[PDB]
Structures are given as structure tokens and as C-alpha cells.
């Protein structure tokens, strides 16, 4: 076919379509209107947005397509360097670091991070137990406090002490502002305007704040010789089985900045959406709370108890199906190739997988795609290959997936064990877009079940 394309803006082509606070949500509406594929042009560039399982299962063939770094990740590369997320597959440091790090991210490795994840989860539950009668919880704010502190603790045994603050640790402040600079740089008139030189000055300082802290922690760890249960230990001790080389100190720094920058926000938004869906769906909240109570029988949850929260696991997947918090990923064609038997591609052509649309493909999931039904995930095996990709694809898939889901299942499990929730404001979903998705303004009241930690 000749591909559908959304409205244009003279020489700017489709570009001003992404000049909005909600670009992915804009793209979903365009996908609904145009179908499983549309072209998108900007000055100097072109990509094609894929929304069907039919086409995306082809895009996910690693023999034909590789990971593309799109403009946002290209700018995040300014501070995360050749860390795993912002490396190209063909860069030596990508495969090196992937080989070294994969065993530290396995489901088995979650046993060793568990105690540290509990440490922060306990701080979350204690915070809520200590709220007064007419106070409420700011959900994405508390989730992001928890996930930042959890990754800091497991990543490099550093305590950001986010539950002790209204203004985050200076590293967090600089990171979130660096992520913001990378995102705002996408929408800029003439990016070289002298009104942005402050933004530039600020970005360079934020990079410095981040490298100085992480470089110093690596330095102190090497000097102390201490062996902890964190990823920094694993990285200073590890050797690539392939090259036989260890990561160098710079690369280790970039990995740590990556884990923090890439991991915190999608995990925090997953938890937020999942609590949003349960408060809007009381029969499913009861099924999840009933499991938490039947399963988490000890003052603090064990790793094996977390693995047993099946229904919580299914809630988390259904939240990821509706609102995958890292909503898109980009590929390039390794060679000329014909997509779907219909769309000829040239070597280097880019594709964008629009994950929220994939997950609403009625031919896969049925007609009820907007409904929240954890039971869709009751059996792992019934879901067709490439139909559910909130963690992307293949060897460039999320190395943090077992970590995110262990973290999310543990904390959602404890939250449902410890409190009844009330959607006291009848909150209207408002999805804010940064690098990730979250429900902005989502607030609840919790009433303690008065169960000891
Ligand atoms: C629910 C939470 C998460 C979601 C939805 C998510 C999603 C994703 C997706 C879609 C990608 C592929 C990006 C691409 O193709 O360009 C990815 C890659 C990656 N993720 Fe996650 N992620 C999450 C949590 C985490 C956490 C907790 C960590 C680390 C602690 C993490 C670390 C990374 C890294 C390093 C990569 C790059 C992997 C590579 O290419 O070798 N993520 N993630
Ligand atoms: N681990 C995921 C880092 C991340 C944050 N936001 C995202 C948006 C798209 C994507 O492919 C990836 C991301
Ligand atoms: Mg229902």
C-alpha cells in the first residue's frame, strides 16, 4: 500500500504534532484513525509508527531489525553515555556490559536484592501508617521516592533518603532536570536561540553533579575494598566471558546513571497505574488484597512469598498492557526488506513500536481492550508471541524487567496487606508524559489495617 500519514504543517511536515505535552497519547489517537501503520515526517527525518501485532511481530525479528536510538535517548546519551540503554548494539561496550550484567539481573539474582527492596518498602508502609486522619497520599510522588531509593540502594548501596525530604537529594534533582532537558530539547523552535544558554549551562552542571557523586562512590568502594550485595560490586568484580575484559570506571558510572535514570520512573509509574486500576476496580482490588493477606503471613515478606503473589503479578501485567510506562521503542532496518508483504523498507529506515496500541489490538485481545481484566494473564502460555511487549524486544529488551516486577509485586503486595484504599477525590485519570508515563495528581486515602511490620 501507500502508507497513511497524519496532517501536515507546510515545511515542518508532521513535526508540530509532537509539539504537545502528551505526544504518545496524540500518536495513539492518530493510530486509531489511521490503522496499523502510518508514516511520520519531520524536516530531515522520517519514521513509521506500527500498532498491530501483525507488523510488530515482524519488526521484532532481530535478523531484520535492530534497536535505533531515537532523538530523546540520543539526548539522554549526553549524560548516560554508553550505558546499556543508550548504546547501539554494535558498540563494543553494549555487548560487554550486557554479558557482564545479565546474571546480576536474573530472577535468581533477585534473591540478593530482596532485603534491600524490603528496607525501602518498609519505609513506604511506615510513612503511610504515620499519616493523620485527614491527610492523603500523593501516589506517583511516593512511588518515585520508593523506586529511586530502591535502585540507589541495590545499584550502589547509596541512600538518597527520599522519605526524609520534600526537595530530593541534589543528584535526583539534577537527574530529573537532565531528563527534562532531554525531553524539552525535542520541541525547540531554533534550538540554538540565546534564550536556551541558561538551559545549556544548567544541563552541564547537572551532568557534573551526577558524575561527581557516582565517580566518588566508585572511588570510595574501590579504596575500601568492601563487597556488598549491590550491582556496583558485581560490576567492579565482573569480567566479560566473551572479551575477558572488565567494565572500566567510566562505563560503570554510566551504568549506574542509567539504572537510576532508565529504571526509576517506569517502575514508579507501573505501581501508580496498578493502584489506580485497583481503586477504580473494587472486585479486582479485593482479589488482590485477599491474595496479599493469604500469602504475606509474616511481618516482612520473603522472596518466596513474593513469587507466590500470582494475582498481584497478573494486576501488574494488566496495568502494563493498558499503560506501558515506557510506551514506545525504535528500530532500524538492517537491510532492504518488505514489511507485512506490503511495505518495502530501505536499509536504515526507522520504525516506532507504539506499545499502547499494540496492547489494544482487538484481533489479539478481543474487543474489550479498554477494560481492566487481570485474568487475561492467568496463563502465561495463552498470549501469542510479540503481542505483549512492555519491556521491548529480544537482546535489547529491558535488562531490569525481573527487578521492576519483583519490586512492584513486593510493594503492591505490602500496600494491599497493610491498608484499605479510598479514591476520595474520584480522581480523573490524567496521564503526564515525561520520558515515561504516569497518572499525574493521583491521590488516595489509606486506612491502616493495623497489622504489625
Ligand atoms: C516497569 C518498569 C520498566 C519498564 C516498563 C521498562 C521498559 C523498558 C523498555 C521498553 C526497554 C527497551 C528500550 C528500547 O528498546 O529502546 C528497556 C530497556 C532497558 N531497561 Fe527497562 N523498563 C523498566 C524498568 C527498569 C529498571 C528497574 C531497570 C534497571 C534497574 C531498567 C533498565 C533498563 C536498561 C539498562 C535497558 C537497556 C537494556 C539493553 O539494551 O541492554 N528498566 N526498558
Ligand atoms: N528501562 C526503560 C527506560 C525508559 C524510560 N522511558 C522510556 C520510553 C521508551 C523506551 O523505549 C524506554 C524508556
Ligand atoms: Mg471490570
From Swiss-Prot:
Heme binds at residue 398. Disulfide bonds: none annotated. Transmembrane segments: none annotated. Changing residue 391 to H: High substrate-free turnover rate constant. Negligible substrate-induced spin-state and substrate-induced heme reduction-potential shifts on addition of saturating concentrations of arachidonate. Changing residue 45 to Q/S: 2-3-fold decrease in binding affinity for N-myristoyl-L-methionine as substrate. This protein is a target of protein engineering. Its selectivity-directing and activity-enhancing mutations have been extensively studied and the designed mutations allow this enzyme to act on non-native substrates and/or in order to enhance production of synthetically desirable end-products. The record marks 266 as: Important for catalytic activity. Changing residue 84 to E: Ineffective covalent modification of the heme macrocycle. Extensive formation of Fe(II)CO complex in the substrate-free form. Induction: By pentobarbital. Expression is negatively regulated by repressor bm3R1 at the transcriptional level. It is found in: Cytoplasm. Residues 1-453 are annotated as: Cytochrome P450. Changing residue 80 to I: No effect in binding affinity for laurate as substrate. High coupling of NADPH consumption to laurate formation. No indole hydroxylation. Favors omega-2 hydroxylation. (9Z)-hexadecenoate binds at residue 49. Changing residue 399 to P: 10-fold increase in binding affinity for lauric acid. In the N-terminal section; belongs to the cytochrome P450 family. This is Bifunctional cytochrome P450/NADPH--P450 reductase. It comes from Priestia megaterium (strain ATCC 14581 / DSM 32 / CCUG 1817 / JCM 2506 / NBRC 15308 / NCIMB 9376 / NCTC 10342 / NRRL B-14308 / VKM B-512 / Ford 19). The chain holds residues 4 to 456 of 1049 of the full protein.
Amino acid at each position: 500500500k501507500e502508507m497513511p500519514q497524519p496532517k501536515t504543517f507546510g515545511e515542518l511536515k508532521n513535526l508540530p504534532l509532537l509539539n504537545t505535552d502528551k505526544p504518545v497519547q496524540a500518536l495513539m489517537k492518530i493510530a486509531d484513525e489511521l490503522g496499523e501503520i502510518f508514516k511520520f515526517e519531520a524536516p530531515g527525518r522520517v519514521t513509521r509508527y506500527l500498532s498491530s501485532q501483525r507488523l510488530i511481530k515482524e519488526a521484532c525479528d532481530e535478523s531484520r531489525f535492530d534497536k535505533n536510538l531515537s532523538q530523546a535517548p540520543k539526548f539522554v546519551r549526553d549524560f548516560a553515555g554508553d550505558g546499556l540503554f543508550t548504546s547501539w548494539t554494535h558498540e563494543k561496550n553494549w555487548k560487554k556490559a550486557h554479558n557482564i550484567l545479565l546474571p546480576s539481573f536474573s530472577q535468581q539474582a533477585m534473591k540478593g536484592y530482596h532485603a534491600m527492596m524490603v528496607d525501602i518498602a518498609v519505609q513506604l508502609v511506615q510513612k503511610w501508617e504515620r499519616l493523620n486522619a485527614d491527610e492523603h497520599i500523593e501516589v506517583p510522588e511516593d512511588m518515585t521516592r520508593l523506586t529511586l531509593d530502591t535502585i540507589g540502594l541495590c545499584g550502589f548501596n547509596y541512600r538518597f533518603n527520599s522519605f526524609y525530604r520534600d526537595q530530593p537529594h541534589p543528584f535526583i534533582t539534577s537527574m530529573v532536570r537532565a531528563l527534562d532537558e532531554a525531553m524539552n530539547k525535542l520541541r525547540r523552535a531554533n534550538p540554538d536561540d540565546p534564550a536556551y544558554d541558561e538551559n545549556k549551562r544548567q544541563f552541564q552542571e547537572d551532568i557534573k553533579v551526577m558524575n561527581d557523586l557516582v565517580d566518588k562512590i566508585i572511588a570510595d568502594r574501590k579504596a575500601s575494598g568492601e563487597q556488598s550485595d549491590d550491582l556496583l560490586t558485581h560490576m567492579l568484580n565482573g569480567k566479560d566471558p566473551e572479551t575477558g575484559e572488565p567494565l572500566d570506571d567510566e562505563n560503570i558510572r554510566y551504568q549506574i546513571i542509567t539504572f537510576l535514570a532508565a529504571g526509576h520512573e517506569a517502575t514508579s509509574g507501573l505501581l501508580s497505574f496498578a493502584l489506580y486500576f485497583l481503586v477504580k476496580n473494587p472486585h479486582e482490588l479485593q482479589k488482590a488484597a485477599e491474595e496479599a493477606a493469604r500469602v504475606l503471613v509474616d511481618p516482612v515478606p520473603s522472596y518466596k512469598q513474593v513469587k507466590q503473589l500470582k494475582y498481584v503479578g497478573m494486576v501488574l501485567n494488566e496495568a502494563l498492557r493498558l499503560w506501558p510506562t515506557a510506551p514506545a521503542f525504535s528500530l532500524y532496518a538492517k537491510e532492504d526488506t518488505v514489511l507485512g508483504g506490503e511495505y518495502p523498507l530501505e536499509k536504515g529506515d526507522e520504525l516506532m513500536v507504539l506499545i499502547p496500541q499494540l496492547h489494544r489490538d482487538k484481533t489479539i485481545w478481543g474487543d474489550d481492550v479498554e477494560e481492566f481484566r487481570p485474568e487475561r494473564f492467568e496463563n502465561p502460555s495463552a498470549i501469542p508471541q510479540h503481542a505483549f511487549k512492555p519491556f521491548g524486544n529480544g537482546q535489547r529488551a529491558c535488562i531490569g524487567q525481573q527487578f521492576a516486577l519483583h519490586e512492584a509485586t513486593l510493594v503492591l503486595g505490602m500496600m494491599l496487606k497493610h491498608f484499605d484504599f479510598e479514591d476520595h477525590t474520584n480522581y480523573e485519570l490524567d496521564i503526564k508524559e515525561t520520558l515515561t508515563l504516569k497518572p499525574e495528581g493521583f491521590v488516595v486515602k489509606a486506612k491502616s489495617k493495623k497489622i504489625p511490620l
